[PDB]
Amino acid sequence: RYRLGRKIGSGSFGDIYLGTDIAAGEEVAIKLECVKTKHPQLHIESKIYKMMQGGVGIPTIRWCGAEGDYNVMVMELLGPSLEDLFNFCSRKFSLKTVLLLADQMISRIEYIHSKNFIHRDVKPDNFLMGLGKKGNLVYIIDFGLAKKYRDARTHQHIPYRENKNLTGTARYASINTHLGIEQSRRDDLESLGYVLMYFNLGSLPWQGLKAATKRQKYERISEKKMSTPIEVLCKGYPSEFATYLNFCRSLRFDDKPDYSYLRQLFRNLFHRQGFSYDYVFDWNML
Ligand SMILES: COc1ccc(OC)c(-c2cc(C(=O)Nc3cc(-c4[nH]c(SC)nc4-c4ccc(F)cc4)ccn3)n(C)c2)c1
């Protein structure tokens, strides 16, 4: 029911291709997993997507299961990632674009959390713009590293644990993630904070650290991140970004974040600039 096209990259635990849904006469994206793999995960991830279905900015998928030597998941085709568009904009976003993105991304993460999961890999590569009439909508992708943090019925939080391996990207990981603490809601939001300052700066001060082993690289990133005060990181930019990061760093393991407070930070800032309020991102202005 699908024709496989060219390879376009890799997800957390599989390979990504373009394809043709011949029944629908539509192009789709296809994720493949070797059926004879040590730790199968595509089916689990598909179940997570299905629990998220219908939410704003949640892609629609179809778990087709096993064809030949591969488990197959099919997703509606989406547009470029925020990293692609960041490079298209020469690696700098205007304050307007950063704040519009911030408002969408805080709420996207809140939705995931409302469905009892934490994402644990918040980074620009995992946010894709929609196509056509939804070209202004930011979608989130990739639940291969997501984890349930509370019981669906009782809302009982999972237990506090330590000595956990880093799951996700080192550049945007929270400080407590580097220290091996079990991730929770606070960590997704802290990662988002680093993503936003990354959009503001073009790079983070813990980028481009040289090391031999990967472990050494991650340790150097961790140390630089813990030795860079938030006020230094955010120097020369509106205080709201530092307030955001400090607020995230003050949350306890099982605290429910005040998402509306953070959105309101950035919205008040947004409303003091004298922008035109047409909803246009930087990449659609050049
Ligand atoms: C027509 O609009 C544009 C404009 C520019 C573009 O590239 C700069 C593109 C464009 C967009 C893609 C693309 O890959 N779209 C896409 C990717 C995924 C995707 N990306 C990743 S990580 C690199 N995993 C998945 C994926 C996840 C689950 C699944 F079942 C299938 C794919 C999902 C849906 N659409 N490609 C190859 C080109 C489209």
Numbering used by the authors: 8 to 293
Provide the authors' own sentences about this structure as they appear in the paper.
In line with this notion, a ligand-protein structure of 16b could be co-crystallized with a C-terminally truncated CK1δ construct and the complex structure was determined at 2.0 Å resolution. In fact, crystallographic data largely confirmed the calculated binding pose of 16b within the active site of CK1δ. As determined by X-ray analysis the 4-fluorophenyl moiety deeply penetrates into HPI, enabled by rotation of gatekeeper Met82 towards Pro66. The bidentate hinge-binding 2-aminopyridine motif forms two hydrogen bonds towards Leu85. Furthermore, Lys38 and Asp149 coordinate a water molecule which donates another hydrogen bond accepted by an imidazole nitrogen of 16b. HRII, however, is addressed by bulky 4-(2,5-dimethoxyphenyl)-1-methyl-1H-pyrrole-2-carboxamide, probably displacing energetically unfavorable water molecules and shielding deeper hydrophobic cavities of the binding pocket. Although the 2,5-dimethoxyphenyl moiety herein mainly interacts with Pro87 by π-aliphatic-stacking, electron density has also been observed within range of Phe95 which can be interpreted by different conformers of 16b, thus indicating additional interaction. CK1δ, however, is addressed by conventional type I inhibition in a DFG-in conformation as confirmed by co-crystallization with 16b. And fourth, fixing the (E)-configuration of cinnamic amides 1 and 2 within five-membered heterocycles led to 4-(2,4-dimethoxyphenyl)-1-methyl-1H-pyrrole-2-carboxylic amide (16a, series 4). Especially 11b, 16a, and 16b exhibited excellent efficacy with IC50 values in the single-digit nanomolar range in standardized kinase assays and are therefore among the most potent CK1δ inhibitors reported to date.
Protein kinase CK1δ is a member of the ubiquitously expressed and constitutively active Ser/Thr-specific CK1 (formerly known as casein kinase 1) family which comprises the six human isoforms α, γ1, γ2, γ3, δ, and ε, together with their closest relatives the tau tubulin kinases 1 and 2 (TTBK1/2) and vaccinia-related kinases 1-3 (VRK1–3). Pathophysiologically, identification of mutations within the coding region of CK1δ as well as deregulation of CK1δ expression and/or activity levels as important determinants in development and progression of severe human disorders such as Alzheimer’s disease (AD), amyotrophic lateral sclerosis (ALS), familial advanced sleep phase syndrome (FASPS), and cancer has dramatically increased interest in the development of potent and selective small molecule kinase inhibitors for both therapeutic approaches and basic research. The present follow-up study reports on the optimization of lead structures 1 and 2, respectively, leading to stable novel inhibitors of CK1δ/ε with IC50 values in the low nanomolar range. Deriving from hit compounds 1 and 2 we report on design and synthesis of novel sets of highly potent and specific ATP-competitive inhibitors of CK1δ thereby confirming modeled binding modes by X-ray analysis in CK1δ and also in comparison to p38α.
